[PDB]
Design an enzyme around this catalytic site. Structure first.
Site, PDB file in Angstrom:
ATOM      1  N   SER A 106      -0.773  -8.482  -1.831  1.00 10.63           N
ATOM      2  CA  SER A 106      -0.049  -8.710  -3.112  1.00 10.63           C
ATOM      3  C   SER A 106      -0.193 -10.233  -3.380  1.00 10.63           C
ATOM      4  O   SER A 106      -1.077 -10.674  -3.329  1.00 10.63           O
ATOM      5  CB  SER A 106       1.416  -8.411  -2.832  1.00 10.63           C
ATOM      6  OG  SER A 106       1.940  -8.071  -4.127  1.00 10.63           O
TER       7      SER A 106
ATOM      8  N   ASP B 241      -0.111   1.999  -7.737  1.00 10.36           N
ATOM      9  CA  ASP B 241       0.318   0.611  -7.832  1.00 10.36           C
ATOM     10  C   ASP B 241       0.423   0.120  -9.558  1.00 10.36           C
ATOM     11  O   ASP B 241      -0.578   0.129  -9.913  1.00 10.36           O
ATOM     12  CB  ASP B 241      -0.445  -0.434  -7.027  1.00 10.36           C
ATOM     13  CG  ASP B 241       0.013  -1.719  -6.790  1.00 10.36           C
ATOM     14  OD1 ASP B 241       0.940  -2.150  -7.809  1.00 10.36           O
ATOM     15  OD2 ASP B 241      -0.331  -2.305  -5.646  1.00 10.36           O
TER      16      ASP B 241
ATOM     17  N   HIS C 200       1.915   0.583  -3.678  1.00  7.32           N
ATOM     18  CA  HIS C 200       2.111  -0.921  -3.335  1.00  7.32           C
ATOM     19  C   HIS C 200       2.894  -0.972  -2.043  1.00  7.32           C
ATOM     20  O   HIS C 200       3.799  -0.152  -1.880  1.00  7.32           O
ATOM     21  CB  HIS C 200       2.688  -1.494  -4.329  1.00  7.32           C
ATOM     22  CG  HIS C 200       2.578  -3.137  -4.238  1.00  7.32           C
ATOM     23  ND1 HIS C 200       1.333  -4.103  -4.857  1.00  7.32           N
ATOM     24  CD2 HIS C 200       3.379  -4.194  -3.742  1.00  7.32           C
ATOM     25  CE1 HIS C 200       1.690  -5.214  -4.546  1.00  7.32           C
ATOM     26  NE2 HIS C 200       2.776  -5.466  -3.879  1.00  7.32           N
TER      27      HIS C 200
HETATM   28  C1  D8F Z   1      11.160  -5.364  -2.824  1.00  6.66           C
HETATM   29  C2  D8F Z   1       9.934  -4.773  -3.624  1.00  6.66           C
HETATM   30  C3  D8F Z   1       8.680  -5.181  -3.173  1.00  6.66           C
HETATM   31  C4  D8F Z   1       8.066  -6.428  -3.573  1.00  6.66           C
HETATM   32  C5  D8F Z   1       7.257  -7.490  -2.688  1.00  6.66           C
HETATM   33  C6  D8F Z   1       6.079  -7.014  -2.351  1.00  6.66           C
HETATM   34  O1  D8F Z   1       5.737  -5.909  -2.300  1.00  6.66           O
HETATM   35  O2  D8F Z   1       4.920  -8.247  -2.624  1.00  6.66           O
HETATM   36  C7  D8F Z   1       4.654  -8.431  -3.853  1.00  6.66           C
HETATM   37  C8  D8F Z   1       4.097  -9.683  -3.936  1.00  6.66           C
HETATM   38  C9  D8F Z   1       3.546 -10.254  -5.043  1.00  6.66           C
HETATM   39  C10 D8F Z   1       3.370  -9.405  -6.245  1.00  6.66           C
HETATM   40  N1  D8F Z   1       3.177  -9.839  -7.209  1.00  6.66           N
HETATM   41  O3  D8F Z   1       2.199 -10.769  -7.422  1.00  6.66           O
HETATM   42  O4  D8F Z   1       3.432  -9.476  -8.414  1.00  6.66           O
HETATM   43  C11 D8F Z   1       4.060  -7.953  -6.045  1.00  6.66           C
HETATM   44  C12 D8F Z   1       4.460  -7.618  -4.901  1.00  6.66           C
END
Ligand code: D8F
Ligand code: 6NA
Ligand code: 6NA
Length: 309
Positions: free
Chosen positions: A159, A251, A281
Site C-alpha cells: 500500500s 481492493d 487490500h
Molecule cells: C485500517 C484499515 C487499513 C488501512 C491501512 C492500510 O492497509 O495501508 C494502506 C496504506 C496506504 C494506502 N493508501 O495509499 O491509500 C491505503 C492503505
C-alpha cells in the site's frame, strides 16, 4: 456480487459486526493503536530467526530507525530486501508489519531491513519518501553496522509502502546508489491517483480499506497530484527495474496497481502482474484470520525467486 473467498467473507462479516469508529473519528494515537490491534489479531505469528536487530541510519531530518531480519547469523554478499510498511503514510510502524517481515526473511532466505519512516500528519509528504530513500541508499552502501554486504537492493512494501517502493526505485534509477535495484515488489500499491477509478467506487465500503480511510490518509499526507514522488505513475518508466506488482481483486486501489503494471509493459519492462482473487487490500497481514492469504503471499515469494534467477 464480486467473488469473495469464504474465509475472506467471514473476516469482513466480523469487521462489519465490530462496526467501529472511522479513522477520522479517532484520535491519531487511537487510529494508530487500532491498526496495531488489527494486524496483531489477524496476522500469523512471527517466525523465529537467528537475527532480529534494531539499527538506525542518518536521514535528512535525523536518525531513521530500522530493523534487520535474517534467518542466518552470517551471510555472504547478496541482495538485501528493503521494506516499507503500509498505513497510508499515517499509521503503521515496525511492529505492525514485523511478522510479515519475519515471514519474508524466512521464506526468501535473504536479509530484510524494515524502515521506520516519519509519518503524517506530523511529517507530511515527502517525509516518508525522504526516509525510505535514505535508508535504502544506506543499506545499499554495505555499512559495517548491517553486518551483511549488499550486491543489490530489493525494495518492497504494501500500500503506501508499495508507493514508496516505486518512488525509491525511480529515485535510485535517476541517481544510483552504490548497488542497483535488482527487483522491486510493490504490493497493492498506490501508483496513480485512485480518485475516479472504477475500483474505488466498487469497493468503497466493506473491503477492509475504505474510501473514507483513503481520504483520511490523503488529507494528512498532502501529496501533490503533479509530483511523481506522490504519484509515481507520472515518473519515467523506461528503465524501471524488474518488477512484481501484486494486487487484490477487491481492493479500492486495485486499478492503481493495474495502471502501473500496464505502464511498465508499455515501456517494455519486465513485470509479473498477480491479482489475487477473492481477497482484499491488506491480505499480506491477515494470514491467520484469513488462512488462504498465506498462499497468496507464497505466490509473491515464488515470483520473487523466479525474477531473481
Ligand atoms: C485500517 C484499515 C487499513 C488501512 C491501512 C492500510 O492497509 O495501508 C494502506 C496504506 C496506504 C494506502 N493508501 O495509499 O491509500 C491505503 C492503505
Ligand atoms: C470495477 C470493479 C469490478 C471488477 C471488474 C474488473 O475486473 O475489471
Ligand atoms: C479501458 C482502457 C483500455 C486500455 C488503455 C491503455 O491501453 O492504456
Amino acid at each position: 456480487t464480486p467473488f469473495i473467498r469464504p474465509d475472506m467473507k467471514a473476516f469482513l462479516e466480523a469487521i462489519a459486526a465490530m462496526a467501529g469508529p472511522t479513522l477520522a473519528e479517532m484520535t491519531l494515537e487511537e487510529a494508530r493503536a487500532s491498526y496495531v490491534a488489527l494486524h496483531g489479531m489477524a496476522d500469523r505469528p512471527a517466525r523465529e530467526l537467528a537475527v532480529i536487530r534494531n539499527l538506525s541510519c542518518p536521514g535528512p531530518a535525523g536518525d531513521i530507525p530500522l530493523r534487520l531480519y535474517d534467518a542466518r547469523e552470517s551471510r555472504e554478499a547478496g541482495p538485501v530486501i528493503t521494506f516499507y510498511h503500509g498505513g497510508g503514510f499515517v499509521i503503521g510502524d515496525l511492529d505492525t508489519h514485523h511478522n510479515l517481515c519475519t515471514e519474508i526473511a524466512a521464506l526468501m532466505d535473504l536479509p530484510v531491513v524494515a524502515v521506520d519512516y516519519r509519518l503524517a500528519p506530523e511529517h507530511p509528504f515527502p517525509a516518508a519518501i525522504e526516509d525510505c530513500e535514505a535508508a535504502t541508499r544506506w543499506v545499499a552502501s554495505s555499512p559495517s553496522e548491517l553486518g551483511r554486504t549488499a550486491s543489490g537492493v530489493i525494495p518492497i512494501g504494501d500500500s503506501a509502502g508499495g508507493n514508496a517502493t516505486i518512488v525509491v526505485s525511480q529515485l535510485l534509477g535517476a541517481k544510483p546508489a552504490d548497488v542497483p535495484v535488482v527487483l522491486q515488489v510493490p504490493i497493492f500499491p498506490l501508483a496513480s491517483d485512485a480518485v475516479g477509478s472504477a475500483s474505488l467506487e466498487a469497493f468503497a465500503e466493506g473491503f477492509v480499506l475504505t474510501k473514507a480511510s483513503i481520504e483520511f490518509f490523503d488529507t494528512a499526507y498532502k501529496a501533490d497530484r503533479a509530483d511523481p514522488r506522490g504519484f509515481p505513475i507520472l515518473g519515467d518508466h523506461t528503465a524501471a527495474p524488474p518488477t512484481i506488482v501484486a494486487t487484490a481483486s477487491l481492493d479500492p486501489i486495485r486499478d492503481s496497481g493495474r495502471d502501473y503494471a500496464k505502464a511498465l509493459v508499455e515501456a517494455g519492462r519486465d513485470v509479473v502482474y498477480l491479482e489475487m482473487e477473492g481477497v482484499t487490500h491488506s491480505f499480506t497481514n491477515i494470514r491467520a484470520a484469513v488462512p488462504s492469504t498465506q498462499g497468496d503471499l507464497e505466490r509473491i515469494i515464488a515470483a520473487m525467486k523466479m525474477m531473481l534467477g
